[PDB]
Design an enzyme around this catalytic site. Structure first.
Site, PDB file in Angstrom:
ATOM      1  N   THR A 152       4.786   3.210   2.069  1.00 46.60           N
ATOM      2  CA  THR A 152       6.125   3.156   2.676  1.00 46.60           C
ATOM      3  C   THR A 152       6.409   4.473   3.443  1.00 46.60           C
ATOM      4  O   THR A 152       5.972   5.546   3.018  1.00 46.60           O
ATOM      5  CB  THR A 152       7.185   2.836   1.579  1.00 46.60           C
ATOM      6  OG1 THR A 152       6.827   1.620   0.909  1.00 46.60           O
ATOM      7  CG2 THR A 152       8.607   2.696   2.130  1.00 46.60           C
ATOM      8  N   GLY A 153       7.113   4.359   4.566  1.00 45.98           N
ATOM      9  CA  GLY A 153       7.487   5.484   5.417  1.00 45.98           C
ATOM     10  C   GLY A 153       8.986   5.681   5.500  1.00 45.98           C
ATOM     11  O   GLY A 153       9.599   5.413   6.534  1.00 45.98           O
ATOM     12  N   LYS A 190       1.801  -3.750   8.713  1.00 44.78           N
ATOM     13  CA  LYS A 190       2.934  -2.839   8.826  1.00 44.78           C
ATOM     14  C   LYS A 190       4.158  -3.671   9.117  1.00 44.78           C
ATOM     15  O   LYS A 190       4.177  -4.456  10.068  1.00 44.78           O
ATOM     16  CB  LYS A 190       2.668  -1.820   9.945  1.00 44.78           C
ATOM     17  CG  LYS A 190       3.674  -0.661   9.965  1.00 44.78           C
ATOM     18  CD  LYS A 190       3.252   0.265  11.086  1.00 44.78           C
ATOM     19  CE  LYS A 190       3.996   1.564  11.104  1.00 44.78           C
ATOM     20  NZ  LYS A 190       3.546   2.387  12.268  1.00 44.78           N
ATOM     21  N   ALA A 197       8.750   2.238   7.590  1.00 44.45           N
ATOM     22  CA  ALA A 197       7.928   1.028   7.552  1.00 44.45           C
ATOM     23  C   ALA A 197       7.181   0.852   6.229  1.00 44.45           C
ATOM     24  O   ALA A 197       6.670   1.818   5.664  1.00 44.45           O
ATOM     25  CB  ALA A 197       6.934   1.032   8.703  1.00 44.45           C
ATOM     26  N   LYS A 198       7.093  -0.395   5.758  1.00 43.17           N
ATOM     27  CA  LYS A 198       6.345  -0.759   4.559  1.00 43.17           C
ATOM     28  C   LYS A 198       4.978  -1.256   5.060  1.00 43.17           C
ATOM     29  O   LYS A 198       4.918  -1.820   6.146  1.00 43.17           O
ATOM     30  CB  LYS A 198       7.075  -1.895   3.822  1.00 43.17           C
ATOM     31  CG  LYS A 198       6.494  -2.235   2.457  1.00 43.17           C
ATOM     32  CD  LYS A 198       7.402  -3.181   1.641  1.00 43.17           C
ATOM     33  CE  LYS A 198       8.505  -2.439   0.912  1.00 43.17           C
ATOM     34  NZ  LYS A 198       9.527  -3.356   0.352  1.00 43.17           N
ATOM     35  N   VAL A 199       3.898  -1.029   4.290  1.00 44.92           N
ATOM     36  CA  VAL A 199       2.538  -1.508   4.633  1.00 44.92           C
ATOM     37  C   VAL A 199       2.056  -2.338   3.458  1.00 44.92           C
ATOM     38  O   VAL A 199       2.063  -1.843   2.334  1.00 44.92           O
ATOM     39  CB  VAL A 199       1.530  -0.355   4.927  1.00 44.92           C
ATOM     40  CG1 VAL A 199       0.153  -0.901   5.330  1.00 44.92           C
ATOM     41  CG2 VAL A 199       2.066   0.585   5.992  1.00 44.92           C
ATOM     42  N   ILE A 212       0.895  -1.158   0.000  1.00 48.37           N
ATOM     43  CA  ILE A 212       0.000   0.000   0.000  1.00 48.37           C
ATOM     44  C   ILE A 212       0.934   1.209   0.000  1.00 48.37           C
ATOM     45  O   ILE A 212       0.969   1.955  -0.986  1.00 48.37           O
ATOM     46  CB  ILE A 212      -0.963   0.033   1.232  1.00 48.37           C
ATOM     47  CG1 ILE A 212      -1.939  -1.155   1.253  1.00 48.37           C
ATOM     48  CG2 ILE A 212      -1.744   1.379   1.307  1.00 48.37           C
ATOM     49  CD1 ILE A 212      -2.591  -1.420   2.677  1.00 48.37           C
ATOM     50  N   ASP A 272       0.952  13.986  16.605  1.00 41.69           N
ATOM     51  CA  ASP A 272       1.195  14.097  15.158  1.00 41.69           C
ATOM     52  C   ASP A 272      -0.103  14.072  14.379  1.00 41.69           C
ATOM     53  O   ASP A 272      -0.204  13.405  13.352  1.00 41.69           O
ATOM     54  CB  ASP A 272       2.178  13.028  14.629  1.00 41.69           C
ATOM     55  CG  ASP A 272       2.831  13.409  13.301  1.00 41.69           C
ATOM     56  OD1 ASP A 272       2.732  14.590  12.903  1.00 41.69           O
ATOM     57  OD2 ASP A 272       3.384  12.517  12.639  1.00 41.69           O
TER      58      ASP A 272
HETATM   59  C1  LIG Z   1      -7.203   2.249  -1.105  1.00 39.73           C
HETATM   60  O1  LIG Z   1      -6.152   3.200  -0.966  1.00 39.73           O
HETATM   61  C2  LIG Z   1      -5.567   3.495   0.245  1.00 39.73           C
HETATM   62  C3  LIG Z   1      -4.758   4.650   0.447  1.00 39.73           C
HETATM   63  C4  LIG Z   1      -4.178   4.945   1.704  1.00 39.73           C
HETATM   64  C5  LIG Z   1      -4.419   4.064   2.781  1.00 39.73           C
HETATM   65  C6  LIG Z   1      -5.247   2.902   2.600  1.00 39.73           C
HETATM   66  N1  LIG Z   1      -5.497   1.983   3.631  1.00 39.73           N
HETATM   67  C7  LIG Z   1      -4.761   1.715   4.743  1.00 39.73           C
HETATM   68  N2  LIG Z   1      -5.331   1.131   5.769  1.00 39.73           N
HETATM   69  C8  LIG Z   1      -4.556   0.970   6.852  1.00 39.73           C
HETATM   70  C9  LIG Z   1      -3.206   1.390   6.922  1.00 39.73           C
HETATM   71  C10 LIG Z   1      -2.466   1.424   8.194  1.00 39.73           C
HETATM   72  C11 LIG Z   1      -3.184   1.662   9.398  1.00 39.73           C
HETATM   73  C12 LIG Z   1      -2.491   1.840  10.615  1.00 39.73           C
HETATM   74  C13 LIG Z   1      -1.082   1.896  10.650  1.00 39.73           C
HETATM   75  C14 LIG Z   1      -0.319   2.156  11.906  1.00 39.73           C
HETATM   76  O2  LIG Z   1       0.877   2.406  11.829  1.00 39.73           O
HETATM   77  N3  LIG Z   1      -0.969   2.145  13.071  1.00 39.73           N
HETATM   78  C15 LIG Z   1      -0.389   2.437  14.373  1.00 39.73           C
HETATM   79  C16 LIG Z   1      -1.349   3.388  15.101  1.00 39.73           C
HETATM   80  O3  LIG Z   1      -2.392   3.657  14.536  1.00 39.73           O
HETATM   81  N4  LIG Z   1      -1.071   3.853  16.319  1.00 39.73           N
HETATM   82  C17 LIG Z   1      -1.896   4.745  17.092  1.00 39.73           C
HETATM   83  C18 LIG Z   1      -3.222   5.163  16.735  1.00 39.73           C
HETATM   84  C19 LIG Z   1      -3.968   6.076  17.530  1.00 39.73           C
HETATM   85  C20 LIG Z   1      -3.364   6.582  18.703  1.00 39.73           C
HETATM   86  C21 LIG Z   1      -2.055   6.177  19.068  1.00 39.73           C
HETATM   87  C22 LIG Z   1      -1.320   5.258  18.269  1.00 39.73           C
HETATM   88  C23 LIG Z   1      -0.360   1.698   9.452  1.00 39.73           C
HETATM   89  C24 LIG Z   1      -1.053   1.499   8.250  1.00 39.73           C
HETATM   90  C25 LIG Z   1      -2.730   2.021   5.741  1.00 39.73           C
HETATM   91  O4  LIG Z   1      -1.452   2.531   5.701  1.00 39.73           O
HETATM   92  C26 LIG Z   1      -0.956   3.219   4.546  1.00 39.73           C
HETATM   93  C27 LIG Z   1      -0.254   4.481   5.056  1.00 39.73           C
HETATM   94  C28 LIG Z   1       0.570   5.142   3.929  1.00 39.73           C
HETATM   95  C29 LIG Z   1       1.279   6.389   4.496  1.00 39.73           C
HETATM   96  N5  LIG Z   1       0.280   7.334   5.021  1.00 39.73           N
HETATM   97  C30 LIG Z   1      -0.534   6.790   6.111  1.00 39.73           C
HETATM   98  C31 LIG Z   1      -1.258   5.509   5.643  1.00 39.73           C
HETATM   99  N6  LIG Z   1      -3.515   2.170   4.672  1.00 39.73           N
HETATM  100  C32 LIG Z   1      -5.817   2.619   1.339  1.00 39.73           C
END
Ligand SMILES: COc1cccc(Nc2ncc(-c3ccc(C(=O)NCC(=O)Nc4ccccc4)cc3)c(OCC3CCNCC3)n2)c1
EC number: 2.7.11.1
Length: 311
Positions: A18-19, A37, A20-22, A16, A129
């Protein structure tokens, strides 16, 4: 070696982001889509204990407007976090696609941000953030708060003046400022403080002066003034945001910030469905789920609950 254990439980699809890869993946047993992630332990280095901190915080957060953690898998080289997949993408992209949101649509989305952030504060954490790249739309077009860059603790355009200056601050006050920037971007489609040069952007944030577009209502302008105070002590409290007159307009009830997603109450249908995949009895199963180890059992139970909620 690194993907072996993960492939026992998930079918992997494409990356999906990259920053970590998802990566997008499918949980084999339920058929539910998830976002995985992937973090390299060697690449993280000195930052590794901070990843363990984020994980422990997410494990303590379970809420209708917070992206759900399902499973944590650690191998020799990697840490995998299996999370709720939000097919609607980023709020960042949504605002751009729409140009800007009406006051009414802004309130629909802003009340969801308030719900999530107030709950994070109630649990003893600050996000630090908040920005539209950290808010995703789920399959029901409802928002889910994420923290992609490991900032939450027990981006300059959204940072509070005190946070930039390296002064001591309260995370809750920094979150209220960031929420003010989000409120502005939702209703205007551009930042209140912006510049091509980082130093000139820093000056603009410290000064706190911003243009007020002609389309903003008097009530929207007042709420923005209450959130965007350079002095953190002059910022509205989260408690007062929950029932703020702008927030209440067309709703007439304060923001429901308490969690609807429990840790204590187990769903009998999901415990039953889960128990068929294990050789043990039902009570042994309930006891194991209640340990919330964030292993495959936790993932299966929570994904069955998501599958049930769709029906
Ligand atoms: C269809 O097109 C698309 C387009 C875009 C996204 C999606 N979908 C989609 N769903 C799920 C993810 C995901 C969710 C959580 C975490 C995470 O790192 N959580 C940790 C966390 O939430 N802590 C936390 C929360 C609240 C309080 C304290 C701590 C990492 C990845 C995703 O990632 C893609 C990234 C790409 C870089 N920008 C941000 C999103 N993408 C789909």
């Amino acid at each position: 070696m690194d993907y072996d254990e993960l492939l026992k439980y998930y079918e992997l699809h494409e990356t999906i982001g990259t920053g970590a890869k998802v990566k997008l993946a499918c949980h084999i047993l339920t058929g539910e889509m998830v976002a995985i992630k992937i973090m390299d332990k060697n690449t993280l280095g000195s930052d590794l204990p901070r990843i363990k901190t984020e994980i422990e915080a997410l494990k303590n957060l379970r809420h209708q407007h917070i992206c759900q953690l399902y499973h944590v898998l650690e191998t020799a080289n990697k840490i995998f976090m299996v999370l709720e997949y939000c097919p609607g993408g980023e709020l960042f992209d949504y605002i751009i696609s729409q140009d800007r949101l009406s006051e009414e649509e802004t309130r629909v989305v802003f009340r969801q941000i308030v719900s999530a952030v107030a709950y994070v504060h109630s649990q003893g954490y600050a996000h630090r953030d908040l920005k539209p790249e950290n808010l995703l739309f789920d399959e029901y077009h409802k928002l889910k708060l994420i923290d992609f860059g490991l900032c939450a603790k027990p981006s300059l355009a959204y940072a509070a003046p005190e946070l930039i200056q390296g002064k001591s601050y309260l995370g809750s006050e920094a979150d209220v400022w960031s929420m003010g920037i989000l409120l502005y971007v939702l209703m205007c489609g551009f930042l209140p403080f912006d510049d091509d040069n980082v130093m000139a952007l820093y000056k603009k944030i410290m000064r706190g002066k911003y243009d007020v577009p002609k389309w903003l209502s008097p009530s929207s302008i007042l709420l923005l003034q209450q959130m965007l105070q350079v002095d953190p002590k002059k910022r509205i409290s989260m408690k007062n945001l929950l029932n703020h007159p702008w927030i209440m307009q067309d709703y007439n009830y304060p923001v429901e910030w308490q969690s609807k997603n429990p840790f204590i109450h187990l769903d009998d249908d999901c415990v039953t469905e889960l128990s068929v995949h294990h050789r043990n009895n039902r009570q042994t199963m309930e006891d194991l789920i209640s340990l919330w180890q964030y292993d495959h059992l936790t993932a299966t139970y929570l994904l069955l609950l998501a599958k049930k909620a769709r029906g």
